[PDB]
């Protein structure tokens, strides 16, 4: 459904005299079933829209579900320190765009992979969710 | 001289054109 001033339109498709464009992203991901039976458009989705996925592929637990079609991960990594022969827990808050194909709560691990810049902060896009139930603030390395 | 230069330049272009169509037609049986 199309609320705003501009008419929202699925690109690369002509009505002629509904249809939906759907894309296999590859790298071992099953292109999920709810993309193929749902009214949303989004050009910044991997599957429906026009964003090609490429390069580095991350995992981490979700913090925020607050913005429209954007979430925040925290990647969670150990840093070896040479002197003290011992690691320390570090983290990094990585904001990442979501397709409305997915259904994402707070506090569940996802995967992401990078694309072109969609904003200042966003350069990543969600390609697979695992659900989790039920919290965040665990430190979890993968 | 300058007409023999100009005719020759045209001919070479002509020569390239015929041998380019050969590189299609030689490989057309395989392609």
């Amino acid at each position: 459904v199309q609320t705003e001033r501009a008419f929202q339109k699925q690109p690369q498709l002509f009505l002629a005299s509904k249809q939906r464009y759907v894309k296999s992203i590859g790298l071992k991901i099953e292109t999920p079933k709810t993309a193929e039976e749902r009214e949303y458009i989004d050009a910044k989705c991997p599957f429906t829209g026009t964003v090609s996925i490429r390069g580095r592929v991350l995992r981490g637990v979700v913090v925020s579900t607050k913005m429209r079609r954007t979430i925040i991960i925290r990647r969670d990594y150990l840093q070896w320190i040479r002197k003290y022969k011992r690691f320390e827990k570090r983290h990094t808050k990585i904001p990442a765009h979501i397709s409305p194909a997915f259904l994402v709560k707070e506090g569940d691990l996802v995967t992401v992979a990078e694309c072109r810049p969609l904003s200042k902060t966003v350069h990543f896009n969600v390609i697979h969710v695992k659900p989790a139930a039920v919290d965040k603030r665990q430190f979890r390395v993968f | 001289r300058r007409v023999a230069r100009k005719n020759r330049m045209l001919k070479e272009r002509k020569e390239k054109r015929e041998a380019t169509k050969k590189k299609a037609e030689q490989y057309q049986a395989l392609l």
Partner: protein
């Protein structure tokens, strides 16, 4: 901000070339060309510090400009022209034919060869694409755009190339059980028979074998498929990319 810069220093010049740390600061910057900066070897350096004909660099720029030298059919009066892997070098006056090709260790060597062999050369497919009227065509590790190339010509295939006419006579296919000289990294300059090809998700690995019976991997882009099953299509050096080991 950096631009394209002329003055190559020694030290920063590559470790192929066997340059003195002394004998001045600057080395000869290669001109732009088919081959890259790092892999190549100019013909200013070729006549100074292999064959040892031109003692000074003034004398080296003399003999290229007399037009004795021929890179790969053509004359080339430009000098400092990058020449690297499988290029023929015909030389006028006391003529000798060479092919430029790697040592055991990674260094360049220079090899007197028979004239009937030294007509042709090999050319690996780097990039395959379509363009102009549905026609497939191929770039090489030179940068020779071989258009109207035949089928069974995919990436990492060699092409034997006749030089007098712009032909591609054979095509040595990539496979298991096929000889391949490595041309980059740590295993640069080494012959191997290809036992395994490991596909790599996204951005792949290939495992090799000497006649001695050592074993070593590399990235796929480094291997140059030299000829089909033991016997290659080329005169190889002394030792034959085996490399000593005690």
């Amino acid at each position: 901000p950096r631009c394209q810069r002329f003055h190559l220093k020694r030290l920063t010049a590559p470790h192929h070339w066997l340059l003195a740390k002394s004998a001045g600061k600057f080395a000869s910057h290669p001109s732009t060309g088919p081959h890259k900066l790092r892999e190549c070897l100019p013909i200013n350096i070729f006549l100074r510090d292999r064959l040892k004909y031109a003692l000074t660099a003034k004398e080296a720029v003399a003999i290229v400009k007399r037009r004795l030298v021929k890179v790969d059919g053509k004359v080339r009066t430009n000098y400092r022209y990058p020449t690297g892997l499988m290029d023929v070098i015909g030389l006028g006056k006391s003529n000798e034919l060479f092919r430029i090709i790697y040592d055991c260790k990674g260094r360049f060597c220079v090899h007197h060869i028979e004239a009937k062999e030294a007509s042709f050369k090999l050319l690996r497919v780097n990039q395959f694409k379509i363009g102009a009227k549905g026609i497939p065509h191929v770039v090489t590790h030179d940068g020779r755009t071989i258009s109207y190339v035949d089928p069974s010509v995919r990436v990492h295939d060699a092409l034997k190339f006749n030089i007098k006419t712009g032909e591609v006579e054979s095509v040595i296919k990539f496979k298991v059980g096929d000889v391949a000289m490595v041309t980059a990294g740590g295993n640069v300059g080494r012959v191997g028979t290809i036992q395994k090809i490991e596909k790599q998700m996204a951005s792949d690995i290939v495992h090799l074998k000497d006649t001695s019976g050592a074993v070593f991997a590399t990235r796929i882009m480094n291997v140059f498929v030299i000829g089909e099953n033991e016997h290659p299509l080329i005169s190889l050096p002394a030792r034959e990319g085996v490399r000593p080991s005690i």
